[PDB]
Amino acid sequence: ATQSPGDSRRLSIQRAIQSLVHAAQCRNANCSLPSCQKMKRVVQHTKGCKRKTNGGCPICKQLIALAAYHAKHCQENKCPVPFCLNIKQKGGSGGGTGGGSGTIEGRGDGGTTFEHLWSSLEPDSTYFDL
Template identity: 40%
Template sequence: MGLQLRKMLDLLVHASQCQCRSSLCQYPNCRKVKGLFRHGMQCGTRASGGCAVCKKMWYLLQLHARACKESKCHVPRCRDLKEHLRRLQQHSDSRRRAAVMEMMRQRAAEVAGEVAGNVE
């Protein structure tokens, strides 16, 4: 992960917990990220409607959620996104298991056919 992106994700975590109400925060872009959080709550267009700001924010939130190990993370939607990613992984695992089982079933049928052909 690039340094700029890493810094942005660190800023995302900081801004989600920062209580500073003024520009005195040690993170110079903290207020901007808090503004993005507000935008996300108030936007009528949303990412699904094509809002570029919301799309960028969702991208960062998803990147954060993939790497986050905190069970009580304060980053907006982190827990929801982690749960969604967990369900996607479970679904993928189930499909993979089903494909392997089907392949094994087909192979067993082929072997059984070969054995039956050799017996006759």
């Protein structure tokens, strides 16, 4: 069983994550993918983003979302991607942020509820997949 039906959201998430983990380390001139080359932009920006602690940009936050999926799929405990291990060091639990409750649509259903954050992505999304 490979590429079996389920839901396109899972696939969209997969393509984005796969392209991100790869682009973050892709040093090969051979590699030529639209997702790989666009991801280079966000990874280069985020690798230089230190203002996060004061007031980071939106890309700084949005990157961490997809990297958190790879964080649970990285077999290597010493993740080469710097944001992957950063998520591990934070847990992402919040432990007091409101337990992710009070939503209208998202009562622990769909399994990809976080996807609603893409609704705030730029309408032009010149750095991510529209």
